RNA sequence: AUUAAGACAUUCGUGAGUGAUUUAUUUCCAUGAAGUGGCGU
C-alpha cells in the first residue's frame, strides 16, 4: 500500500505537465531515494491512505508555472462516503 | 205530517319562556453548522 498522492502524481506526468519541485516522489520507507519512473516490473498497490485520517475532496497540485493549477477532486464513486471526521481528538487541559 | 221541526263542537289561545358548542389539551419530540485541508524530502 502506497500514497494516493503519489498515485495522483503518476498520471499527471504521464502526459507533459511538469510539476514544481526538485525531488521525485518518495518510494520506500527510508533513505534518500527518488523515483519519477516505473515502480517495478510486478506492480504496486494504491489505496486512499489519507481517507481514514480525515476524508478530503479536492487536491491542488502546483504546476511549474504559477499561471495555472491542476486539480484532483474525489467522490465516493457510488455516493456513499461523503464524509469522515478525523478519528483523532486533541484535548488541551491546563 | 209520522214522540215531529229547528242548531257547523264552535269562540277565545304564538310551541312559547329559561339556556355561550362550552370544558380539558404546550405545535411538540429527536437532531453537533458541521467535515476535510492540499501543494515542491
TrEMBL record:
It comes from the Bacteria. This is Uncharacterized protein. It comes from Bacteroides fragilis. The lineage of its organism: Bacteria, Pseudomonadati, Bacteroidota, Bacteroidia, Bacteroidales. The chain holds residues 283 to 376 of 469 of the full protein.
Amino acid at each position: 500500500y502506497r500514497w494516493e498522492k503519489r498515485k495522483m502524481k503518476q498520471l499527471i506526468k504521464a502526459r507533459g505537465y511538469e510539476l514544481k519541485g526538485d525531488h521525485s516522489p518518495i518510494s520506500g520507507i527510508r533513505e534518500n531515494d527518488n523515483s519519477w519512473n516505473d515502480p517495478n516490473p510486478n506492480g504496486y498497490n494504491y489505496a486512499y491512505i489519507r481517507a481514514i485520517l480525515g476524508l478530503a475532496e479536492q487536491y491542488e497540485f502546483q504546476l511549474e508555472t504559477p499561471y495555472q493549477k491542476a486539480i484532483v477532486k474525489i467522490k465516493s464513486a457510488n455516493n456513499c462516503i461523503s464524509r469522515y471526521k478525523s478519528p483523532l481528538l486533541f484535548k488541551i487541559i491546563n
